[PDB]
């Protein structure tokens, strides 16, 4: 329908957040790309409503939850980021996405701005039950070691540089696999699970709600499991969930939990990550200055997976800005 | 916004044809890419007016000029080539590829079925007026050794291996220019002097007409210069031109003269050629078996180009022709 | 231990043949490369002896049979063809490599200048009685079909665009199988068997007998299955064979009779191929012009393969022939 | 016929660094690497003396200053760093680097692990004097910016996250630039100056000083410009500078005093960087198991430069700890 349109958003929302790249403005990066997200959203034949988004109304004055969006067509959930990775972006760090998911009604988990425990692993074969947030760490990786046919010594484990994530890095050492730490971007690094060169075969860890419903939507079209669980310490988080209709405050939610029926996924790189490379500057002798941009676009139904390089023409003399919409 | 959606027709008609490459039939090749690219046409949402279909109007019955594809939308000017090399694709020559481009109502030149005399050369930069049919082989070529700023003996040039062009190669090479051969389709030949690693320079050639302006109209979006002439043997090769709007008939066209506006061209790989990779057969134990297709997708007012890798999933324990309808 | 130095006599003979493409001078095209190779050889610190090639002396090529080369080092059996594609060099064709092969003195097979059955299937894991000469098209194609796990109709198979072959191109295709001819070199064609994006499956053809040793030496090394017989028509073929004690006129021939004990593999693209990708000429604004070339070294002990892409500067305005030196 | 065997060195050391990735043990990675690295360099055909190792008599058991190393050959200065970030790969950050560099007598700066300000930007269209550490960020950013003919806006600079940093982030920010930061691995920040899709420009920083001279070989191959500085801030350090040579502490040091004449760089990546990709994991259905390695080769005098792509076989159904020596 609809598919290969959304990647010009991500493109977009990319170019400018790559306008704000090594700037250490965050506000500024955030703003640049919900600005281009926002005005290339509206441009494509969709009755969609933004289900998650820069926040609540009253926060969020563009891409707010409930936001009607999109010029006329098939009626679809939209869930975004036009950042992944503000701080990221404003850093020049790895694993910064713009990204972009669209399913039928009320096919994305209704989540909070709240912590979520993750674990996937990627795979078309046959994982399911292959992964258990009650289950141990060894366990997890037995059994993921198992389904890849190597030796647990051989398989990389992602998950995030913080103190909430120093017991997983211990067991899954002393149980004998290999921990990489990234600084930021779970999304990324869950993806990477599933994505064909990256060099990590499990993520685990905690981060944002919303960050794992997009990459369990990519999951979805790439094939793999997935089990999350929102997490609170603060009964302001649980107000918050309760009025989001989540009553079932420890439920783990597999894949199919998270996002159901006819997904489409789209993202585009901003810096290097696990998952795509960043935006570049070329300048060819042929058709002169441009700038590149790495994206992917994927389908959960026909499950076609499309790998999109494009050269974008700029003159280069006159300041990045103009990349901002 | 028309242009993206152009790809998946592209694709579905490179994957039909690979169906039928190796396999001895022209008829079952080109009549099966034929086939899928207008079964996907016929589900696109477009109005298309056919400039360059297949049949004059006798040959078959549903691959016309003056057809109506698509479904409704701009009516936009649609030249086809479901599948160029089509001896060649049914026993793995090289440049077999699935061509749909589309403009303004004659953005083009509307083409008979006569012979063209073609030269072309790539990149946009700053020559203008460059190459002449009249003008000689070896004055053409100097003067773009001066342009592209090499010695001539670097200079490659390419010629469709037929005795017609005897004359050219022995000239070219006289001039001492290395000059390379196929045997196969000009349009891949065309484009790859303006596509980036392709090792081609020049084409100077005959060919079919319609093969002319399809390459003409890449040539707009990757910033080319190409002259063209058209030439008749017996006086109904003159008949269908006057009964068209023609009565210069040797006019020689530039660049602007056979394709200008605003234009799109997709073009995806049968079989390796100079310009894209042909399908190929792949098994990830990520992901399981699927199909590669290697794409390109070209605008002549933004100058984006886009290349596309598109994973088609497929069980390789099915009949190849699954891919045909 | 001379592995990785023999890409260097490959690549200075593909530069050098290069300088030739398409300038259809066959003999000044291989008298470059067999220069180039010659004085790289030479200035390898091996006790090396040319033991496959065409030719004795002043017969055919310049580097013959029996010639003692290099600056030293170990004593070593060399086969060549120092380009197996002088046909297709100076005729602008597709898979034009410069080859080279190591073994320990009496490593390959003394075969007498005669053509020769093979067929040729790639995977790490195939049975050796996977391939056999005495059988069926058709049992060989469903038998290594059943191995790959594929329809038989997904097979690619390929063959030399030869009158000779055309019965099997018939059998083979009448599998519902299909079938790509090649114009050119059988080297390239056989290794494209256990090439990572060949997009072929199976070599079945008949040809010389050098080129079947340096296919036997590569895919030693790749892994995968190769069964060859000489062809002995005329009492004058016989004796030249009892001239050098090969009793059995019919015996099949694996990799390990073709090839045996510490082999070393190396070849570099001259065009365009199944195998290799051809020279390039590359003009980039920060290094500056350079030629490309993509070669492969390998060797049997390690099975290691490494993959060589590597920038010769060269200013360009001057005359294209000083590789050649 | 020595230049290409310091690839396999390099990869050695990788493979066995890889074996220690995201372990928590920076000894042992850093002693697989020493252990790996003096092991395969003793098979080279060199009189190797070591001039920039792991420390000196004292410190260093394994790669001491002064150490002979290699089989026996032509008499070269070595520089080595066997892994670069010992505590990148421990965590699986980005930029682990096996490194190793070769020149004749005296063709290197003999650099003691003191620390080194340095700035670098690339290009072989004649740069230089361009950068000087005396100047302002300010100064040095318009000239880098006017000489790649770019808009200052455009320029990335990039710096490890450091506080010692924070003046250059501070003042290069505000000529209006772009600033990335990198947690360690000054080598690959400072050779993605001058590697082709670094989205890199310039480096500016301090850092290790012999991790200055090796990054000073690689731009003496690809072509850039590099100044730098030691430091010498305890007394200890000051009296251990003038015991080789050494008396004006405050000298700043060109590129060609850095590294000069007929130098070898070899590299390969452990984690994925700004230079190259780390070592993978891949199961491919044709080829087997293997990990890949991706490393650069260079020269200096010919200014060739070779991207090597290595397979090493391996069943991953053995302990990792196999790819150590
Ligand atoms: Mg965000
Ligand atoms: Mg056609
Ligand atoms: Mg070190
Ligand atoms: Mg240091």
């Known amino acids: 329908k609809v598919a290969l349109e959304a990647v010009r958003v991500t493109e977009l929302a990319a170019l400018a957040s790559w306008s704000q790249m090594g700037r250490g403005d965050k506000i500024a990066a955030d703003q640049a790309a919900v600005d281009a997200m926002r005005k290339a959203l509206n441009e494509v034949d969709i009755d969609g409503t933004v289900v998650i988004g820069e926040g609540e109304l009253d926060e969020a004055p563009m891409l707010y939850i409930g936001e009607k969006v999109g010029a006329g067509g098939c009626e679809v959930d939209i869930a975004l980021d036009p950042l992944e990775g503000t701080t990221i972006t404003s850093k020049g760090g790895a694993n910064a996405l713009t990204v972009l998911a669209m399913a039928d009604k009320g096919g994305f988990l209704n989540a909070p701005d709240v912590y979520m425990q993750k674990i996937a692993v990627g795979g ?83 981060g944002g709600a919303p960050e794992g419903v997009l990459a369990a939507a990519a999951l979805k079209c790439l094939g793999g499991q997935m089990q999350a669980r929102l997490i609170f310490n603060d009964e302001e988080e649980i107000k918050r969930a309760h009025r989001l209709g989540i009553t079932d405050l420890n439920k783990k939610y597999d894949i199919d939990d998270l996002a159901s029926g006819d997904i489409v996924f789209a993202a585009t790189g901003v810096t290097d990550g696990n998952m795509l490379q960043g935006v570049k500057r070329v300048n060819s002798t042929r058709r002169g200055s441009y700038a590149v941009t790495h994206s992917v676009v994927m389908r959960s139904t026909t499950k076609t997976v499309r790998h999109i390089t494009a050269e974008h023409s700029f003159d280069f003399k006159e300041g990045i800005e103009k990349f901002m919409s």
């Open 124 to 206: 078309i074969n046959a994982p399911k039950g292959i992964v258990d947030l009650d289950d141990s760490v060894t366990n997890n990786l037995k059994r993921i070691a198992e389904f890849k046919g190597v030796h647990m010594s051989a398989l990389v484990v992602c998950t995030m540089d913080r103190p909430r994530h120093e017991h997983i890095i211990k067991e899954a050492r002393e149980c004998g696999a290999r921990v990489i730490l990234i600084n930021d971007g779970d999304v990324s690094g869950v993806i990477a699970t599933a994505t064909e060169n990256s060099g990590i075969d499990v993520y685990i860890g905690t």
